[PDB]
Design a protein around this ligand. Sequence first.
Ligand code: QO1
Ligand code: Y01
Ligand code: Y01
Ligand SMILES: *[C@@H]1O[C@H](CO)[C@@H](O[C@@H]2O[C@H](CO)[C@@H](O)[C@H](O)[C@H]2NC(C)=O)[C@H](O)[C@H]1NC(C)=O
Ligand SMILES: *[C@@H]1O[C@H](CO)[C@@H](O[C@@H]2O[C@H](CO)[C@@H](O)[C@H](O)[C@H]2NC(C)=O)[C@H](O)[C@H]1NC(C)=O
Ligand SMILES: *[C@@H]1O[C@H](CO)[C@@H](O[C@@H]2O[C@H](CO)[C@@H](O)[C@H](O)[C@H]2NC(C)=O)[C@H](O)[C@H]1NC(C)=O
Ligand SMILES: *[C@@H]1O[C@H](CO)[C@@H](O[C@@H]2O[C@H](CO)[C@@H](O)[C@H](O)[C@H]2NC(C)=O)[C@H](O)[C@H]1NC(C)=O
Ligand SMILES: *[C@@H]1O[C@H](CO)[C@@H](O[C@@H]2O[C@H](CO)[C@@H](O)[C@H](O)[C@H]2NC(C)=O)[C@H](O)[C@H]1NC(C)=O
Ligand SMILES: *[C@@H]1O[C@H](CO)[C@@H](O[C@@H]2O[C@H](CO)[C@@H](O)[C@H](O)[C@H]2NC(C)=O)[C@H](O)[C@H]1NC(C)=O
Ligand code: NAG
Ligand code: NAG
Ligand code: NAG
Ligand code: NAG
Ligand code: NAG
Ligand code: NAG
Length: 1232
Amino acid sequence: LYTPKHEAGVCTFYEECGKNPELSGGLTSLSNVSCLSNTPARHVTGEHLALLQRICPRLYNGPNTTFACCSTKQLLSLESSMSITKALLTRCPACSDNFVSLHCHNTCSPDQSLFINVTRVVERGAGEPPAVVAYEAFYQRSFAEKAYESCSQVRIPAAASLAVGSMCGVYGSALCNAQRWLNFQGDTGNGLAPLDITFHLLEPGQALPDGIQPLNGKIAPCNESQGDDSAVCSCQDCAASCPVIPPPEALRPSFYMGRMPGWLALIIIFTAVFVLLSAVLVRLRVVSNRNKSPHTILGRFFQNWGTRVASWPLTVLALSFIVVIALAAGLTFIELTTDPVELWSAPKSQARKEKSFHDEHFGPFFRTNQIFVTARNRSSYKYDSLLLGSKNFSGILSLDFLLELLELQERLRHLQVWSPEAERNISLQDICYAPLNPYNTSLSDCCVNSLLQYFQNNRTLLMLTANQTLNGQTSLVDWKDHFLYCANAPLTFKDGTSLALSCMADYGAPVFPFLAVGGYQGTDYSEAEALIITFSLNNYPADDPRMAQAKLWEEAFLKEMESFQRNTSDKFQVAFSAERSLEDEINRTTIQDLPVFAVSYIIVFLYISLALGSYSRCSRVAVESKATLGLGGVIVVLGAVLAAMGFYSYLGVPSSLVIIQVVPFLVLAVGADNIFIFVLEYQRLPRMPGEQREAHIGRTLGSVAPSMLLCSLSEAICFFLGALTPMPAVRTFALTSGLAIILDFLLQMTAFVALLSLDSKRQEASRPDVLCCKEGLLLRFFRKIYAPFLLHRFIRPVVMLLFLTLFGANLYLMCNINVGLDQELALPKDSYLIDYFLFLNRYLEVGPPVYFVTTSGFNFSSEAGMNATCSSAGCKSFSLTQKIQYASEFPDQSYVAIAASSWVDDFIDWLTPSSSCCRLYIRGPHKDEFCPSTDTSFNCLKNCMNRTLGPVRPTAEQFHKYLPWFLNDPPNIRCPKGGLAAYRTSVNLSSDGQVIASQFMAYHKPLRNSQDFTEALRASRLLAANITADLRKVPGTDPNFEVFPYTISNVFYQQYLTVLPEGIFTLALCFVPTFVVCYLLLGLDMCSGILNLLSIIMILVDTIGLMAVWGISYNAVSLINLVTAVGMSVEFVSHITRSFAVSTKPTRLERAKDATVFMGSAVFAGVAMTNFPGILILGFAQAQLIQIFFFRLNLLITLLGLLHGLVFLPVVLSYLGPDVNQALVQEEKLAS
Ligand SMILES: CS(=O)(=O)NCC#Cc1ccc(N2C(=O)[C@H](CC[C@H](O)c3ccc(F)cc3)[C@H]2c2ccc(O[C@@H]3O[C@H](C(=O)O)[C@@H](O)[C@H](O)[C@H]3O)cc2)cc1
Ligand SMILES: CC(C)CCC[C@@H](C)[C@H]1CC[C@H]2[C@@H]3CC=C4C[C@@H](OC(=O)CCC(=O)O)CC[C@]4(C)[C@H]3CC[C@]12C
Ligand SMILES: CC(C)CCC[C@@H](C)[C@H]1CC[C@H]2[C@@H]3CC=C4C[C@@H](OC(=O)CCC(=O)O)CC[C@]4(C)[C@H]3CC[C@]12C
Ligand SMILES: *[C@@H]1O[C@H](CO)[C@@H](O[C@@H]2O[C@H](CO)[C@@H](O)[C@H](O)[C@H]2NC(C)=O)[C@H](O)[C@H]1NC(C)=O
Ligand SMILES: *[C@@H]1O[C@H](CO)[C@@H](O[C@@H]2O[C@H](CO)[C@@H](O)[C@H](O)[C@H]2NC(C)=O)[C@H](O)[C@H]1NC(C)=O
Ligand SMILES: *[C@@H]1O[C@H](CO)[C@@H](O[C@@H]2O[C@H](CO)[C@@H](O)[C@H](O)[C@H]2NC(C)=O)[C@H](O)[C@H]1NC(C)=O
Ligand SMILES: *[C@@H]1O[C@H](CO)[C@@H](O[C@@H]2O[C@H](CO)[C@@H](O)[C@H](O)[C@H]2NC(C)=O)[C@H](O)[C@H]1NC(C)=O
Ligand SMILES: *[C@@H]1O[C@H](CO)[C@@H](O[C@@H]2O[C@H](CO)[C@@H](O)[C@H](O)[C@H]2NC(C)=O)[C@H](O)[C@H]1NC(C)=O
Ligand SMILES: *[C@@H]1O[C@H](CO)[C@@H](O[C@@H]2O[C@H](CO)[C@@H](O)[C@H](O)[C@H]2NC(C)=O)[C@H](O)[C@H]1NC(C)=O
Ligand SMILES: *[C@@H]1O[C@H](CO)[C@@H](O)[C@H](O)[C@H]1NC(C)=O
Ligand SMILES: *[C@@H]1O[C@H](CO)[C@@H](O)[C@H](O)[C@H]1NC(C)=O
Ligand SMILES: *[C@@H]1O[C@H](CO)[C@@H](O)[C@H](O)[C@H]1NC(C)=O
Ligand SMILES: *[C@@H]1O[C@H](CO)[C@@H](O)[C@H](O)[C@H]1NC(C)=O
Ligand SMILES: *[C@@H]1O[C@H](CO)[C@@H](O)[C@H](O)[C@H]1NC(C)=O
Ligand SMILES: *[C@@H]1O[C@H](CO)[C@@H](O)[C@H](O)[C@H]1NC(C)=O
């Protein structure tokens, strides 16, 4: 049972006996145990020498000597046994050779007795040698550590982990040293080691037992080539052969313009424009001090128009109603598009072109339905685990919680629905994603990720306990030791803690700890706060019928999860989501709060009716109010709204939630201003003796029509210019609003003028109006209280200083601008998805995957093509997957956390003849056809390719012939690599076997804010451009070959890379024709134009500043609201400014006083008080996009408009206003 003598030249065993009686089980075919024989080494010649030279190249010692101690049977058994490990480690030949060197030194070395002590045997009967079942081996520490370190970084791209992580048992790749690695190699409990070998890594200073000396042989270093191999390992594979480059500085972040922040550019632009305009305006004032009729043209035209309209009022009302009904009739063809991708992004953007390419070539990205579960009040605890130290465990990991979650998951898997179209029950196995067995799938094949997958969703295995004696002490093993083992080493076929439990999921895939649990730091997997249950379903195109079935199943999923959410509030806090939830939640409340909004029309009707009358009695106001004109106003507004929506429905343009819930109420806030001002001016001007009411209304319309035309044109032009946004919802909003404003103006100049004529006709008869069968408080208040106060000599410099202070303060506050909109922001206030997004932001440890997709034009069959893509030994440095690996080493500068997988490296590795993966039938019915790795017959002794002196590279014919076999070969214990699961959907093959498109999957780091999605997009695009530029240098590459980074979030966040240049350019385009129309229409006074433009700039800057303070981010929706501000503020500025300009008072102060009282009262009572019921009613929206971006911004715009129009502007007109237009002075004097 031992080796009595071990001087030199002798070995401890030679012939291979039968099977090992002790283990009895295994994963694969094992290796028979050698029989003990202490005997001098054998003289190895002939074919035995050829076998030795091939199997163990570091034992051949000359042509004619080569003493060794193993038979041909042991050499063949060793060659069979190491095929799996060689299949994993062949990427770095130095590592493969070192591992094989260790095994063939143990098995066949002629100096076997110098380091091996046999300790335990089993007798095989009298006259027979006993078989060896346990022994120990002695090595130097430096030898084993160099051998380990040469293999320490070899990677498994398909699993995105280290190969050493599958070879160190309970210790993962993070905690594995040479001792643990060698202990795993000798541990028979894993189902792989044929016999028990104890490894002593005896140190050199240490004194050793009698004749034993530690082994110290040759170890191939990482970076050193051996002979003429030229197969030096790349540093992705061993981390010792690439030059050191200091970590790259991060790139200039998006939301920065040029070399400076975007807000700094905003301050520079607004300040420069303001100071230039102010300097020019004051220059004109001092020039006027040194110096000590288009209005009539439009007046005459509008008087003729008004008189014709007043002449025939019933006919024009008839045509107005006919046109309004004819346009509104288009609502029968209305179509609503509810998908987020369609509204959020343009159909011909860059991200959508990439999305279309990916979806066409590889299929759409699968639908992910997730559940996050945490523990409400359970405390943590300790567990004295086996093979590890004491481990803290979280409260959520309590066994009863896992049992009820197992009941939940199993209940969800067996959920079935009725399909009205298919006329059958749809179960999970009909629509689920399945990486293994895609066709003829079952429930056991569906992709479902959870912690419970470590126990293959089997209740009996979860509750199992076992007795294990380690270090001489018997203890108890339960599910927690399997959990810790799998969390550290997820690539385990068999656990060693007395339980033969696979660590793989039931559908055949490893479950990585970041996919099962979350809420941890470092490698403290047992402390995880939240558990994650993920269902992945196949996606399809929207038109395809299968999508409806998937949506029905997800609906049942949502109802079941709401049931389990309500049922157990005493144990868990649960967040959950479904793929269709985002589409359902955003569009849920379009209709629900619309009758709540409808009260604004009633409030506007009542305000217009009461404000224009209801006086002198306060008890007969029911008949003295102007009910007819209120009804007219509200009908004109509704007419414009319905006509605009109808016309766009007639052109096939769809509508959305930004149309239904916003457009009638913003148009309500705008449209009634012009008629309120017109009616007030009608009441104020007295009639001349002998004049008819038609001429009076004509003269009134001639008086006020240029300003109403100015406001309508300015707002309509601003909305149409605001339609340049790439976002379709905002584009549709802008076009609908523009058309509604134009049609509103056209109805105001025809139907309302006619209605005022008919109401005046009724008024002259001193009769009650249709429905209800020379002073005023506004003018007295403004004349006696407001105007003596605002224009007082001790007020005007204070108002000037206060408003310039406010402007400067808002320019400062403009620095705090957020760019981008969070997903939560879109949701309704009470949606369950808000909890889901909070749980994702706190508990996931990885982000979404990113696929670097290569288009057609790249020859993957050429050796130059393979070398510019692979990352194994002999591949070119700075290759595609090595660039991705390098980007993955610095996750904060480039938002990639997990290195890419690659079909090329696994294909080349699979083709390797030494890996026993690609075999051909040598004889029989299927001669020269593919022999699967699971065929255990003797018909498959011919490898796919021949042996080589370097890396394995096929020719073009071999590449095209063998690639469809690789892409359909399922992985198993015999061959780990294969493309059925990981790569079948990642390569597109045309019928001549050509590669049309290909993708390389990698994972982002967790992304939480809009800034993280935007920066991840920028860094990922920069990496893909860097890959594309170097791939284009390979000869034969098409000039239109590119690599692009598809991920599902790109179509939502692409727009935030350009939103600032587009927003600034759009605002400047809004400012230019506004100035042009107010300059040209009001009589070509440069002073008045500059005054209006400066006021609009101040209102806009104040709006942006206070927006930044409040916490409203900048995006396309805020942009269209600021465009609305630029348009709308003309209604607060232009009327007062024109009233000042058209005035005959000799001094600036008197003109400021009279313009302030008359038009200030009209502007206040009309514009402000009409704006409030519309805008304020959106504060009950319950959809956060409207509550935040439409209510708050339009409210701020209205208040700043009122503040600037009524307080600032009269004072500025008093100081810096235009001089007197002498043509009206002469007109007043001559006609006097
Ligand atoms: C020998 S050692 O010394 O080195 N140390 C011990 C070791 C090891 C080791 C080596 C390689 C790996 N993998 C890669 O590489 C593989 C990485 C991922 C792989 O692409 C994959 C497979 C399926 C899938 F959906 C998604 C991805 C992994 C592997 C997994 C499963 C597998 O086969 C399945 O197994 C299931 C089961 O057993 O339950 C059966 O149900 C299925 O039918 C059968 O297809 C073979 C290899 C993992 C562990
Ligand atoms: C006077 C103010 C307060 C409201 C006038 C505005 C109208 C222009 C709105 C109010 C009611 C809306 C309609 C009410 C509900 C629907 C049904 C809707 O169809 C669905 O609900 C299907 C939704 C789905 O399939 O998810 C299509 C839009 C439509 C016609 C809306 C079109 C726009 C309308 C007529
Ligand atoms: C008269 C015109 C010029 C403006 C009138 C509009 C006000 C009604 C707005 C303008 C600024 C707003 C404030 C800006 C800042 C905030 C912080 C905001 O919440 C935060 O971002 C801080 C909360 C936290 O995270 O601690 C709560 C609303 C509030 C008080 C806003 C309350 C409403 C205010 C006073
Ligand atoms: C080789 O292994 C044998 C088997 O254990 C060792 O023999 C035992 O050594 C211990 C050490 O004190 C003694 O107490 C036992 O009496 C020995 N004999 C047995 C178990 O039969 C032997 O010492 C080892 N030799 C070397 C060089 O390490
Ligand atoms: C292979 O890598 C090693 C380590 O990066 C290189 O450098 C050796 O580094 C050790 C540690 O300081 C020194 O003791 C050796 O003298 C260094 N040189 C050699 C030749 O071992 C080594 O140069 C690299 N070899 C090649 C060919 O690149
Ligand atoms: C591989 O890519 C081709 C196109 O390069 C895909 O073929 C298209 O498939 C869509 C439907 O999926 C058809 O509408 C197109 O007409 C097809 N075009 C051509 C040129 O054939 C093919 O489907 C992709 N492979 C897979 C498996 O989806
Ligand atoms: C859940 O796990 C148990 C293991 O305890 C499985 O039960 C074994 O099934 C095999 C195959 O039929 C039998 O040979 C064993 O005798 C069973 N063991 C016991 C204790 O009954 C069980 O099949 C698993 N569940 C499923 C659905 O496969
Ligand atoms: C990719 O490159 C390989 C060679 O690098 C091309 O294979 C050649 O194909 C032509 C076509 O008959 C043969 O005449 C050559 O002899 C082949 N060369 C070799 C080395 O085998 C292959 O055609 C290229 N791919 C494409 C799509 O053109
Ligand atoms: C891809 O990125 C790498 C690293 O960022 C670039 O390599 C550097 O390029 C600059 C010039 O752009 C050189 O001055 C440096 O010497 C290069 N090396 C290093 C280590 O910084 C590479 O050029 C990029 N590819 C392209 C096509 O621009
Ligand atoms: C292994 O042992 C079994 C049983 O003794 C025997 O049938 C088989 O041929 C042996 N194989 C090798 C390669 O030694
Ligand atoms: C479909 O499932 C429901 C679930 O209760 C069941 O009642 C019904 O009979 C099933 N239909 C078929 C055809 O299996
Ligand atoms: C494990 O051993 C202990 C100690 O005798 C014993 O009490 C317990 O029942 C054993 N467990 C099983 C499952 O047999
Ligand atoms: C829900 O909770 C009740 C007790 O609150 C329990 O009896 C029941 O089994 C739970 N599950 C279902 C599906 O009702
Ligand atoms: C690709 O790498 C192999 C490595 O052996 C080399 O032989 C071959 O010449 C390389 N091809 C090119 C085009 O450099
Ligand atoms: C190389 O491979 C080819 C085809 O697989 C085969 O015909 C040939 O015999 C092999 N060996 C040599 C030395 O060419």
